[PDB]
Design a protein around this ligand. Structure first.
Ligand code: CL
Ligand code: NA
Lengths: 77, 309
């Protein structure tokens, strides 16, 4: 009871850049940190999906986009 | 039969707007007379419609100087084919009263196949575009030329059918975008390697033949569905608006492939929303509403399938 998973330092610049391109603003530090973790989880999802696609599991790849900091559940929450 | 001089200026304007050219005066005159006959047909048919004889209107369009047989010969391309359990669509039985995937962002712009028998490829591509949107959130134009050139079980601009196309995409693990592999309206050599694998899976499901209720369920549940029709009638060639229904349409004379992107009812006439590939100057900005639940009119549910992979 003290943690879980953490933002990866290597993506700090990419996160800053992603926020600018998609015109993202966050109410406060907690909000931003939470959304960064969703975004990192989504990146991992995309990478593994695309790894699968390279192995013929899927006929299509995925890509990070402007919805990147949201969960699946939030398609029409 | 001479042309009607009162239309001379309208003929010139029609030629200019549709980029029409003729090899010689004799051809031009023959084409003008076909156009004037089509115009008279359109006029009388619309008079009959104003009297309740028909549920749809006709209008002149870029096909006006062609006969109906010529349109089928040059700009359709469906060749009819083998129905087994492993490709059979099995619904999971309340569908909405109406569906329109255009409004959900699942349907790309209307395309123009030109004088190439490639409607099978445009139909396949539209269904694939819908499923790609469903799985990724992105709408992209996919490549009919990829299919025309590379589906060796089909015949390019001389025709084909959609499940062969879906099977190709399954074996190939995908299809190119239109940007990467653009449409040229004639068959060329495939950009890629001969097709590998012996097909691990079929890659598509088929609607039980003639079953409009299963087709509705599939449109509601899956997305846009590839379908075939009889497009050999002049009333189809000049369809403009309303719900199309012509008792001379022959469900055993399938010759053209299109895309069911929805269904609904308009002014009490139930319909399928059908995307054509004759450009936007045909029908209603490229679309036709075709009668639904009128005994499988035009064979709309006889050759229906969608990709699944
Ligand atoms: Cl999109
Ligand atoms: Na080509």
């Amino acid at each position: 009871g003290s943690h879980m998973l953490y933002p990866e330092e290597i993506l700090d610049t990419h996160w800053e850049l992603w926020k600018k391109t998609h015109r993202k603003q966050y109410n406060n530090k907690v909000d931003e940190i939470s959304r960064r973790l969703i975004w990192e989880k989504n990146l991992k999802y995309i990478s593994i999906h695309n790894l699968e696609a390279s192995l013929g599991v899927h006929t299509y790849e995925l890509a990070m986009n402007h919805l990147g900091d949201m969960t699946s559940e939030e398609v029409v929450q | 039969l001479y042309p009607e001089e009162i239309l001379d200026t309208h003929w010139e304007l029609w030629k200019k707007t549709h980029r029409k050219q003729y090899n010689n005066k004799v051809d031009e005159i023959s084409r003008r007379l076909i156009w004037e006959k089509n115009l008279k047909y359109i006029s009388i048919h619309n008079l009959e419609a104003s009297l309740g004889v028909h549920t749809y209107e006709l209008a002149m369009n870029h096909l006006g100087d062609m006969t109906s047989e010529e349109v089928v010969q040059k700009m359709t391309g469906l060749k009819v084919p083998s129905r087994s359990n492993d490709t059979l669509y099995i619904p999971e039985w309340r569908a909405p009263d109406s569906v329109d995937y255009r409004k959900k962002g699942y349907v790309t712009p209307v395309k123009n196949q030109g004088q190439c028998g490639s409607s099978w490829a445009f139909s396949s591509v539209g269904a694939l575009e819908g499923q790609l949107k469903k799985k990724t959130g992105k709408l992209l134009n996919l490549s009919p030329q990829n299919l025309v050139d590379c589906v060796s079980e089909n015949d390019g601009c001389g025709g084909g059918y959609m499940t062969n196309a879906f099977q190709y995409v399954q074996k190939n693990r995908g299809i190119d975008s239109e940007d990467a592999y653009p449409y040229v309206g004639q068959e060329e050599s495939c950009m890629y390697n001969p097709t590998g694998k012996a097909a691990k899976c079929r890659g598509y499901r088929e609607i039980p033949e003639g079953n409009e209720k299963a087709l509705k369920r599939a449109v509601a549940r899956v997305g846009p569905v590839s379908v075939a029709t009889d497009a050999s009638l002049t009333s189809f060639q000049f369809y403009s608006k309303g719900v199309y229904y012509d008792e001379s349409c022959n469900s055993d004379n399938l010759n053209h492939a299109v895309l069911a992107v929805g269904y609904g009812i308009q002014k009490g006439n139930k319909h399928w929303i059908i995307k054509n590939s004759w450009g936007e100057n045909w029908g209603n900005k490229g679309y036709i509403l075709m009668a639904r639940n009128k005994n499988n009119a035009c064979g709309i549910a006889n050759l229906a399938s969608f990709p699944k992979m």
